[PDB]
Amino acid sequence: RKAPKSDNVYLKLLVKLYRFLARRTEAPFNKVVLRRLFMSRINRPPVSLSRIARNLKNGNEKKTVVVVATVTDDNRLLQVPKMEVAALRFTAKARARIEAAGGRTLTLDQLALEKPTGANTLLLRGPKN
Amino acid sequence: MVAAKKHVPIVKKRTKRFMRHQSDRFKCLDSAWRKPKGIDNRVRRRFKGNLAMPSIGYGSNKKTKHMMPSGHKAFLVHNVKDVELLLMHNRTYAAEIAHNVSSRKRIDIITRAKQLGVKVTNAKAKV
Amino acid sequence: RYAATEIAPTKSARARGSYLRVSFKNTRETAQAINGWKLQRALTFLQNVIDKKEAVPMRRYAGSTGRTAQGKQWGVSRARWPVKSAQFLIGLLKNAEANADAKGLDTGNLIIKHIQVNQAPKQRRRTYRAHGRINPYMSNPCHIELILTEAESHLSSRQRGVRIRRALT
Amino acid sequence: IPPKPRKILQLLRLRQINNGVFVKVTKATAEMIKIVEPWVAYGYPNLKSVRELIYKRGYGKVNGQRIPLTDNAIIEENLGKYGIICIEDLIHEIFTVGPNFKQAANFLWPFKLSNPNGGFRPRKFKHFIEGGDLGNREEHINALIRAMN
Amino acid sequence: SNVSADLIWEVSRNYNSFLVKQRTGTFSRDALNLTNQHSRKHAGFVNDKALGIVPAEKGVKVIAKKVKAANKPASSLYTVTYKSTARKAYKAIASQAAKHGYRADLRQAAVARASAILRSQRPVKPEPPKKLRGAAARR
Amino acid sequence: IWRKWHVKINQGQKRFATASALAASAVAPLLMARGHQVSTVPEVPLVVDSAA
RNA sequence: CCCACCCAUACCCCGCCCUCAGGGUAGAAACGAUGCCCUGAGGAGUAGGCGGCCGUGGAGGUCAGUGACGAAGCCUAGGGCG
RNA sequence: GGGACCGAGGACCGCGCUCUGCAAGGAUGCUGGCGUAAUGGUCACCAGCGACCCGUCUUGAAACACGGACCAAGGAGUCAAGGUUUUGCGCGAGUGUUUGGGUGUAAAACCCGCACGCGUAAGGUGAGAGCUUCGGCGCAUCAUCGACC
RNA sequence: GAGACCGAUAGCGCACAAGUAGAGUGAUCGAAAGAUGAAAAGCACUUUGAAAAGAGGGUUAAAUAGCACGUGAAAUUGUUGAAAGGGAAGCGCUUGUGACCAGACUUGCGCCCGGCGGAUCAUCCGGUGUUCUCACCGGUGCACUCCGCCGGGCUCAGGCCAG
């Protein structure tokens, strides 16, 4: 879609930022992120901390977690590993538990400034069903 | 300056208005265009010898759209401060004083527009 | 406010009448017979209509109207004698003649420059009819008004060259 | 039109009237043209007919677009890997039917011919061998191409 | 931060108190707007760096934003009045708008606005008498 | 008269909108864009002495 | 049987409108980026689907809008725009 | 050689050539009359050609049938309750202030106690978006193999 | 006491001497109808007419507000002006005739000679500001430099139709 259905002015700035990055850079990461920004909310399901903790269990540590959705909290996870997560939104419990474990929280414009190619990024989605 | 910006020639594809079907016979029917909805209507089916239906093929050229034959564009003006908005558009826009503006306020508008070079389309109304 | 506004009231004489209980159609044809006539000839004509010596030609409202030889002066065949319309038009003509006398105009040169019969608001009357209906018997009154008036280059160079040569020769 | 001749006209890219294509003669393509004989006129063109069609009405398929063949460059960007770098190689490939005929003929947009100067014939829906216009003519298609150009 | 020139444009693109639009075009009443067109380029109030030229008694009055004083409107405008030859007014405005990278894209519009103001302060010529035209109007 | 005249809005939405409105009041371009004559006042989050 | 000729909104070339499709546009001398620039193709339409604009009464904001040398309404073989 | 219709774009860039520049990525040069109803436009009328009277209903379609003297004003898919799909927003294992109470510039706005409504209390291979130190890591999810209640 | 209600075919049937006038044996049914003007100053007087009324004259800012009263549409009608019409009119494309009109144009820019009126000419020195190298102000500047005006000449660009 040419125009996002959202009326968020900050989402419009993110679409403009990632339109320039998808046009001028040959990285297919930027094209995927731009596509997911255009999708609706039911097509952007939440991703809990326990699901991304599954995906850093192997050698995927020290890689930036990128989720084009809002990251929730799981009460079933007793310990949260140190991790660097970039997302559209974070809940208060998810942001507090990541920062208590020693990690850091980024927005998608901070990810663009830090990793414009999406280098060493572990990209995730939530459960569709 | 009175002369407008240089433009391509203004072409009107059709100057005649589009008359509503059977508005000539009935006085309860205004001549404003209404699209016929009957399946057997000859205007709807585009039979020859009948009234034409408007379409996007009659659309005017984008470079000459909304231009009066002098070559300017109309801009409705209610006071002196509206004329000063046309300060940088001497070659492209013209001023049109609104119908409810009084006689004293009009004289201020023309005097300012002559200073600014802006053409007034109805400068001789209340003189 | 009269209908003919091009005629100034200073040099003219006018007289009008409203809600006159005469037939509008008979008065329209009577006013058309005397339109543009002299004042003394119109007064003589209207009295002849009363005495049934001259006839008023019926032109528009003449449906199933009888024929007479007095319409041959007008070039028609259907002509009638509206006595009631002639009586009302005499009094309005005598009124305008008195208005000219008071103003000082000459009555011998007065013509009827404007005369108009307009429709008045309709009066109502009812009569009795069978099958549950009531017959409406509306009257059609008329408004009359009359006014009396005293009777009394961008040539080219080639065109300009031909003009000079004809003038010289 | 019956359903079978309709599909062949689509497969031969004859979607419009007065539309022309170049066909390599095989046994598979000859039976295609035999069915659409009540709708087409065909024959064997010479060097002149190939030249005027390419030079005057020659357009190329570039990214799904109809680009006129006004430069030797745009031939080289599209058929340069096949060994075709200019107009004369394109004309040589159509006339002397080479291995890259399929790529060169498909690169050419179907030719939008005009109606012939001088008309067809008194009645043109009979076969050419009974005084009509439909069917196969050996070299008289060159007289038809000259009028339609 | 939360606010920027890009964000203010998104809030005020559709509706603005300076916005005037009718059919033929969309204009702006902003004093910091030069050419008086509604766009991100000429939106003086939206942009951090902007220029605006208003008439004076004799000459032009050029105002410019100071980026350090953006939250202090009483001292946010750097005002210079050029009452001199028109050539020196144009040169100083061009230097003001292009020498130090303060809106070099607006240099042409700034010089053109100073010309149009000073073209309005010259004495005006009397209009020729209107000619009666045609048979009906002349008679 | 049973036409649902009043609208139920979440309290979190109201506090979000009130917080967004307070942030826009600190923006001096947004005050001029509304129609306020803010040119002769400094420090557009205007603070006056309570003793005064 | 032969030659020439007439013309459909059909085919060919050119212009203009609209839609669709493919590209360009930031160490911003930069933009109604909801814009502009380049290129090609397409255009009948009932039921039905989608979108954008016009108009009426009332409300919040705004134009420090218009107005008794005249608001609104009305008439107009007077014009302008679409 | 003789005609007809058109001049589209608007600094340079390109492909080329008959070379002190060219006809080569779209028209310039010279001249005349007029500078006003002259071109242009709007009505009225004549002339050449074209042209069933609208709507409803039936039917494959017509035909029949019904409504229509004219004008002005009014005039017909609305509201509520309960379900359901999609889009936007807030918070998110939670969410819902507005039954009520506390303030108030008083039917607004602001704040909130205890309950209550709805929900909540483990992989491989063919793959597979994406990343890569180019050795491999591989989201969601499908085919299948799975593990458990 | 109020209203994101209605505004004289609406809103209660009733904004008015409305449950009135009127209808029915009766129970009952049940309308239509607001507005001159700020102030009646609501035509003195004269004249014609039997009268109703009309014309002068007068009141008013307005009689284009005459208690048939604010504004005053359409259907329909009259008069005047223009036109058309050998068994329908009305409509579409295209000229022509006649009537009536909107624009456009009226000169601008530059250069060169003269003649006037003035020193916001270049540089430098002091303050101020700012984008920190650009400006403003005061002085110096004194007259081959700068700015206005007038009188000539030249170039370019200027409207409509054409070759």
mmCIF file of C-alpha atoms in Angstrom, chain D residues 39-145:
data_model
loop_
_atom_site.group_PDB
_atom_site.id
_atom_site.type_symbol
_atom_site.label_atom_id
_atom_site.label_comp_id
_atom_site.label_asym_id
_atom_site.label_seq_id
_atom_site.Cartn_x
_atom_site.Cartn_y
_atom_site.Cartn_z
ATOM 1 C CA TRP D 39 -9.060 -14.801 -40.422
ATOM 2 C CA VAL D 40 -5.460 -14.277 -41.625
ATOM 3 C CA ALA D 41 -3.449 -13.585 -44.764
ATOM 4 C CA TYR D 42 0.127 -14.844 -44.857
ATOM 5 C CA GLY D 43 3.048 -15.435 -47.160
ATOM 6 C CA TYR D 44 6.793 -15.393 -47.640
ATOM 7 C CA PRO D 45 8.359 -11.925 -47.281
ATOM 8 C CA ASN D 46 11.497 -10.785 -49.063
ATOM 9 C CA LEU D 47 14.410 -8.647 -47.902
ATOM 10 C CA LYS D 48 12.628 -5.363 -48.631
ATOM 11 C CA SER D 49 9.527 -6.246 -46.601
ATOM 12 C CA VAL D 50 11.657 -7.237 -43.608
ATOM 13 C CA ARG D 51 13.625 -3.986 -43.866
ATOM 14 C CA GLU D 52 10.695 -1.546 -44.082
ATOM 15 C CA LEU D 53 8.837 -3.307 -41.276
ATOM 16 C CA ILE D 54 11.810 -3.179 -38.884
ATOM 17 C CA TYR D 55 12.916 0.351 -39.767
ATOM 18 C CA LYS D 56 9.478 2.006 -39.862
ATOM 19 C CA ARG D 57 7.247 -0.082 -37.572
ATOM 20 C CA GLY D 58 9.865 -1.807 -35.430
ATOM 21 C CA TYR D 59 9.287 -1.671 -31.681
ATOM 22 C CA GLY D 60 10.886 -3.677 -28.891
ATOM 23 C CA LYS D 61 9.699 -5.364 -25.706
ATOM 24 C CA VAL D 62 11.809 -3.788 -22.951
ATOM 25 C CA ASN D 63 10.564 -4.697 -19.441
ATOM 26 C CA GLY D 64 7.060 -5.208 -20.786
ATOM 27 C CA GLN D 65 7.076 -1.859 -22.599
ATOM 28 C CA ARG D 66 6.823 -0.905 -26.276
ATOM 29 C CA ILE D 67 10.044 0.993 -27.041
ATOM 30 C CA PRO D 68 10.767 2.158 -30.615
ATOM 31 C CA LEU D 69 14.015 0.951 -32.184
ATOM 32 C CA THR D 70 15.575 4.383 -32.612
ATOM 33 C CA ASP D 71 19.006 3.483 -31.190
ATOM 34 C CA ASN D 72 21.383 0.586 -31.766
ATOM 35 C CA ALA D 73 22.033 0.650 -28.014
ATOM 36 C CA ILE D 74 18.617 -0.624 -26.909
ATOM 37 C CA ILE D 75 19.004 -3.565 -29.281
ATOM 38 C CA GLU D 76 22.339 -4.308 -27.598
ATOM 39 C CA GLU D 77 20.926 -4.113 -24.060
ATOM 40 C CA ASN D 78 18.160 -6.559 -24.943
ATOM 41 C CA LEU D 79 19.618 -8.974 -27.523
ATOM 42 C CA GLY D 80 23.350 -8.400 -27.039
ATOM 43 C CA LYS D 81 23.886 -11.711 -25.266
ATOM 44 C CA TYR D 82 22.497 -13.489 -28.333
ATOM 45 C CA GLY D 83 25.076 -11.741 -30.528
ATOM 46 C CA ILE D 84 22.700 -9.081 -31.903
ATOM 47 C CA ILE D 85 24.053 -5.549 -31.473
ATOM 48 C CA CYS D 86 22.426 -3.438 -34.202
ATOM 49 C CA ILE D 87 19.453 -3.234 -36.555
ATOM 50 C CA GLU D 88 21.151 -5.100 -39.413
ATOM 51 C CA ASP D 89 21.767 -8.151 -37.222
ATOM 52 C CA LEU D 90 18.090 -8.070 -36.236
ATOM 53 C CA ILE D 91 17.107 -7.863 -39.910
ATOM 54 C CA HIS D 92 19.599 -10.612 -40.795
ATOM 55 C CA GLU D 93 18.177 -12.880 -38.099
ATOM 56 C CA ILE D 94 14.548 -12.596 -39.215
ATOM 57 C CA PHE D 95 15.282 -12.977 -42.932
ATOM 58 C CA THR D 96 17.978 -15.652 -42.730
ATOM 59 C CA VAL D 97 16.249 -17.632 -39.998
ATOM 60 C CA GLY D 98 18.946 -18.201 -37.412
ATOM 61 C CA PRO D 99 19.008 -19.983 -34.065
ATOM 62 C CA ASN D 100 18.032 -16.836 -32.144
ATOM 63 C CA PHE D 101 14.914 -16.266 -34.254
ATOM 64 C CA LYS D 102 12.593 -17.075 -31.340
ATOM 65 C CA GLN D 103 14.203 -14.475 -29.091
ATOM 66 C CA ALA D 104 14.441 -11.864 -31.848
ATOM 67 C CA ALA D 105 10.863 -12.319 -33.078
ATOM 68 C CA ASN D 106 9.464 -12.221 -29.544
ATOM 69 C CA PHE D 107 11.523 -9.105 -28.803
ATOM 70 C CA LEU D 108 9.713 -7.363 -31.648
ATOM 71 C CA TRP D 109 6.303 -6.039 -30.709
ATOM 72 C CA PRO D 110 3.588 -7.265 -33.114
ATOM 73 C CA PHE D 111 3.481 -4.926 -36.079
ATOM 74 C CA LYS D 112 0.598 -2.444 -36.151
ATOM 75 C CA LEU D 113 0.042 -2.145 -39.891
ATOM 76 C CA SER D 114 -2.302 0.375 -41.426
ATOM 77 C CA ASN D 115 -5.045 -0.462 -43.874
ATOM 78 C CA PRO D 116 -3.721 -1.026 -47.413
ATOM 79 C CA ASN D 117 -3.538 1.787 -49.941
ATOM 80 C CA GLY D 118 -5.731 0.745 -52.853
ATOM 81 C CA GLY D 119 -8.002 -1.567 -50.883
ATOM 82 C CA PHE D 120 -7.961 -5.330 -50.656
ATOM 83 C CA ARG D 121 -10.174 -6.714 -53.458
ATOM 84 C CA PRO D 122 -13.906 -6.527 -54.381
ATOM 85 C CA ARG D 123 -14.632 -9.098 -51.670
ATOM 86 C CA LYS D 124 -11.872 -10.188 -49.335
ATOM 87 C CA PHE D 125 -13.320 -13.026 -47.246
ATOM 88 C CA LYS D 126 -12.780 -15.747 -49.830
ATOM 89 C CA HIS D 127 -9.524 -17.624 -50.255
ATOM 90 C CA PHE D 128 -6.751 -16.076 -52.349
ATOM 91 C CA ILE D 129 -7.150 -18.861 -54.934
ATOM 92 C CA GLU D 130 -10.740 -17.775 -55.624
ATOM 93 C CA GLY D 131 -10.108 -14.053 -55.942
ATOM 94 C CA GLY D 132 -10.116 -13.258 -52.232
ATOM 95 C CA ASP D 133 -7.576 -12.177 -49.665
ATOM 96 C CA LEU D 134 -7.610 -14.869 -46.954
ATOM 97 C CA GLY D 135 -5.098 -17.695 -47.050
ATOM 98 C CA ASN D 136 -1.578 -18.240 -48.373
ATOM 99 C CA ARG D 137 0.043 -16.257 -51.168
ATOM 100 C CA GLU D 138 3.632 -16.995 -52.195
ATOM 101 C CA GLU D 139 5.151 -13.569 -52.833
ATOM 102 C CA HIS D 140 2.007 -11.458 -53.227
ATOM 103 C CA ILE D 141 2.174 -10.750 -49.496
ATOM 104 C CA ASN D 142 4.971 -8.328 -50.415
ATOM 105 C CA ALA D 143 2.482 -6.325 -52.470
ATOM 106 C CA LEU D 144 0.142 -6.420 -49.472
ATOM 107 C CA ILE D 145 2.890 -5.331 -47.057
#
